[PDB]
Design a protein around this nucleic acid. Sequence first.
DNA 1: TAACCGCGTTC
DNA 2: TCTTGAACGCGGTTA
Length: 1122
Amino acid sequence: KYNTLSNNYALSAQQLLNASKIDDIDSMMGFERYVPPQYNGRFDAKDIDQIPGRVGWLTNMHATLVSQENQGISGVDFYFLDEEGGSFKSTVVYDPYFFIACNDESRVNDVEELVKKYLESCLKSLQIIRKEDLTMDNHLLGLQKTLIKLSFVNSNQLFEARKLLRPILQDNANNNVQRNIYNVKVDAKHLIEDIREYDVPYHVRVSIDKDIRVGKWYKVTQQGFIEDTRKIAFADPVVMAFDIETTKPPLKFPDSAVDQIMMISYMIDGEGFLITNREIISEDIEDFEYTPKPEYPGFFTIFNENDEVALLQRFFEHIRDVRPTVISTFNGDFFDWPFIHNRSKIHGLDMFDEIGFAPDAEGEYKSSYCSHMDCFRWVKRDSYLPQGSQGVKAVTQSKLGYNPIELDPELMTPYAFEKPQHLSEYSVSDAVATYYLYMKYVHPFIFSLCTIIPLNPDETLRKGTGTLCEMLLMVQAYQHNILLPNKHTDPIERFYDGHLLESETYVGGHVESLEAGVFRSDLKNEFKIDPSAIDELLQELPEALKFSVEVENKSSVDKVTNFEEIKNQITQKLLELKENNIRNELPLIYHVDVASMYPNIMTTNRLQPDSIKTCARKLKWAWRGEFFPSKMDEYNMIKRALQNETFPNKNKFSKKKVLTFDELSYADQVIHIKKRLTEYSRKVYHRVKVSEIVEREAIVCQRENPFYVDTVKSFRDRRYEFKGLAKTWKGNLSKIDPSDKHARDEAKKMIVLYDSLQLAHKVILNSFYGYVMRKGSRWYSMEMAGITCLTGATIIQMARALVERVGRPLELDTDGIWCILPKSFPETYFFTLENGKKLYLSYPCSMLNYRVHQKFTNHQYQELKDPLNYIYETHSENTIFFEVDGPYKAMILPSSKEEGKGIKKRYAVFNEDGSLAELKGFELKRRGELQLIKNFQSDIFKVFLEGDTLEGCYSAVASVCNRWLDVLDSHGLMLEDEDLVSLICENRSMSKTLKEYEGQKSTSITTARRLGDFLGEDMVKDKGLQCKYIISSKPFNAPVTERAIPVAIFSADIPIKRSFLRRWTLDPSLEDLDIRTIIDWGYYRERLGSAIQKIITIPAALQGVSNPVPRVEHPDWLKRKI
DNA sequence: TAACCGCGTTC
DNA sequence: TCTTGAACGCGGTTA
Ligand SMILES: Nc1ncnc2c1ncn2[C@H]1C[C@H](O)[C@@H](COP(=O)(O)OP(=O)(O)OP(=O)(O)O)O1
Ligand SMILES: [Ca+2]
Ligand SMILES: [Ca+2]
């Protein structure tokens, strides 16, 4: 066992040891390993109650190693809650395996005989299996690839086999030995083509192959787990959510080496607790209540403990008592868990021994028996909030519907002494926000996703949405006996017309800014209808209205009883627009947007990677390349120069110290070529890279195995369910008298939840599109991605061509159009059936959908109708539909400050309600914008509603515009300094650490440097640094990069403040230290200026209005036009 | 100037 | 190791 001459003895011993500690920890938390009783009877699912075993709700799984009870045996532990409120775990053992592919299927026995002997040391078993290969000729006729399936006792032996085979695999494509040159059987090694399914994580392999999912109920029996399809609802796990608050020096981050834990707030199954560190918290806190809304009950019991070690002993003892199987936190992986771990180490406690939590290979904290649900991981991936709204406060407002307690971090340590009850109140607010966010958003979503994705809750919360897509597809391939492709790898080098490409992609979404300014439900607009368009709509009308009834409402025209009246109402309204083209009336503010655009384009056209090759449907995409201007001549020039040079060894642990170019990896060579071809091309030409768009054509086989596209259709439908439930409940709130309140607040709460669930499905669904372009994708197709995008572009431009003939489109982006139609354009109508029921009709929506189905329907969709005889039918598939929302009270579109340009992805929209309907792209939404423009925008957009005329509204908005410019002209204020610095500060997140930006300049890089010089180097040691700065006046003539002054200096001791200010301002004589005298008011004038222009001034000129805010000047390009 | 970058949006 | 995509706005810096 401990023989130091054995391969992998130290790794085997340790991996078995870790399994033994986990078995010991699970046992303490009430997860004994349960072996079901012996039963040698019928192994069927019906009469489940006859078969002995234990019923459980599956709450977790982990890979492990068991001993035979030499090496360990690979298995997965499954963690169950039982029907009598107990818990247990059960182990399934399962040989890890991968495939060998052969080029000669006639000599499979020979390669089998070789590998059996070559892999004696690590191979266990070997077997011939067959699988469908979607790259194989005539696979559609039932022909199968023949594979050698290599099995192992554990995951290490499988990795040992991979290390032994890679030598063989490389010489088979880099060696053809010569010997007798006049000889005009082939060795068995060379028949080895490839290995397949060799990198599937073990626990995924077991979850997929055995069809087990967390979230589902099983009876554990001698023959296997048997899903109890009668068990409905999840079991109720013990859930625990905690927040810690630590001491920290003024202006500095906590450091667990020195800083103490003050308190731990937590909730368990809705009951609140607070532990206090009495060495820091001035007094015993008593049992109090925080219930911010009656559905969020917050009664807390206090444990006043004597010191930090008693606080940690209390936390740990309580966890062992309640035995939680979920523990939830907010950013607990990055802060709370590592802090507790360090304070545990310092006081001589082992956190693993106490509660079985420990850091994993990614530094995240995890246990065997208990999921760690970091709500922040759900906020980043699933909540659909902008990064500016991912804090506790904004998440709580948005999802829970209330303001949680907030406290300046600089007051938190002082307040433990001066205001312990205030701090305890805050701490307990953090626990309450966390517990209820997990219970109402994270818990249902993640545990339900587990029932279809073969991952445990920890991985289902944290894995990329691409990886979630990949897992779903891997189940479908497996269950259809489809062989998995290996992970894709980018070609190290590609050429376009003898030039070396720097980057390849495709043309994506089509987006247009057409008009700027104000549009209102009451303010009138001018139109010029194209008469042609009305004749076409009249020719299309009888088929468009039929289409509406039959396709959009799945009805029949036999049962509609007001068809001709509707047709004539619309027909009369159209005929008037043809005679009276030039009109000036009330505009109707409308939005049309295709439901699930890319997934339905994919679905409609049978788009999937394996389908890209009469089964031929030819679709176009727009390839965009970026390449070096140099020809092949000049490339071979640069290469030859590099071959005369020497290069640092990437291996420190050698006396070599220098490599030749040829000795470098192909990749590292190409990196060196790219560096050189850059600088060369700047000297023989103007530009480092030239782009070029080439339209390409691809074949989409309509017959291929549709496992990929079917998965997308399935997940689309999963999302639609919650989309309709959102609508269903938005309909119920419209039929409720404002007064009820009880029925109002239940509905408003149900709409938030189903919008949240449908939006949580949106990024995963759309990642099925992006997954074909992901690094390491098993199903990579740049063609598929380009086809989806170009088709979307063609569709949205067809829509705009119609709308701009019968109305005025304002802004268009990928699948969406904001426009104004005349008040006298046929709008909303209701059909009547022979059963008294009704059918919605928006003519402006249906006029488009009719044209979409006329022009973008796939008439070549094939489906296998008889799998035994291989009989396909062909049908017509089209699931592409515009949805209409509105009409809306007002929409305001900014304009650029450069000539004949617009702003895309930025606008505001109001209901007749007065309520803000939409706000996009604007700094007030974004993270870390100057708070002035935030608060400005936050205020000015809402006042576009007040006034009677267009000049009237542009001057009512100008009143606020001048009042905001009357804070900034004061070079100061008439309100206090604590609310000045906040109005004037700029946050700006550094995604990385300060050392990794070397050779770059920015307001952030500077603020970080200066913060490190004044408060210590360990202030910039971590990534995600918030750089809270002001920009100085001095040096007067220096780049704005310099003059980034960390606003924290204005909270520093006088002699530190003065010394650093002087050192940065380059002014040794400076005495005046007031914040009002160092601010470059010229910079902030230009930036509130440049906002007021784009939202008020330049739009006014576009809508034939004199500058309604004369304080701000028009640019020269505009003024030389007026 | 023209080209380019980092952040954080809208799709 | 793990890793969805492109298009765009804004304020920056560099040969
Ligand atoms: N996060 C994303 N990842 C990849 N593609 C995306 C993403 N968001 C949007 N897209 C692409 C694919 C979508 O079909 C298209 C239109 O986006 P959008 O209209 O916001 O959503 P959608 O049309 O898919 O759903 P819906 O309109 O029903 O909310 O843009
Ligand atoms: Ca907190
Ligand atoms: Ca859409």
